[PDB]
């Protein structure tokens, strides 16, 4: 199972490439639109660059239900613990 401090560390390096927010602001209690001003037209880009590095297809059915970083870490944790087919081969 992926640790929380590496999930956040992998999400911050994408948020910093897309928007430019320093990775010292990405904490598990920050909202994606109020605290960190990240419109959803940037959440789409984050979800694209996520799949373009680690094969992970986050459908827009679920891309709306992510309001905080804790939601992201919980979603990734549950999907990786449910499916044992996580390749993780680079």
């Amino acid at each position: 199972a992926a640790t929380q401090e590496e999930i956040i560390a992998g999400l911050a390096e994408i948020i910093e490439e897309v928007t430019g927010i320093e990775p010292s602001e990405v904490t598990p209690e920050k909202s994606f639109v109020d605290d960190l001003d990240i419109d959803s037209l940037s959440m789409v880009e984050i979800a694209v660059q996520t799949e373009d590095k680690y094969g992970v297809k986050i459908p827009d059915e679920d891309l709306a239900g992510l309001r905080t970083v804790g939601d992201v870490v919980a979603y990734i944790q549950k999907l990786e613990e449910e499916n044992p087919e996580a390749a993780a081969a680079l």
Binding site: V44, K57, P59, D60
Partner: protein, 50 residues
């Protein structure tokens, strides 16, 4: 008098209009273009985002 004549010839070389072939070939380079664009859009829509 008879025989007197002055016959010029104007240079109207920019006053043209296309034929049926040049029109059928102009109204067929715009339909296939939008058809190809629609096909490329349908191919792009594979990622499941609307």
């Amino acid at each position: 008098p008879q025989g007197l004549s002055v016959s010029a010839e104007i240079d109207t070389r920019f006053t043209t209009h296309p034929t049926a072939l040049k029109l059928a070939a102009m109204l067929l380079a715009i339909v296939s273009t939008v058809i190809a664009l629609l096909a490329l859009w349908r191919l792009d829509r594979l990622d499941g985002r609307r």
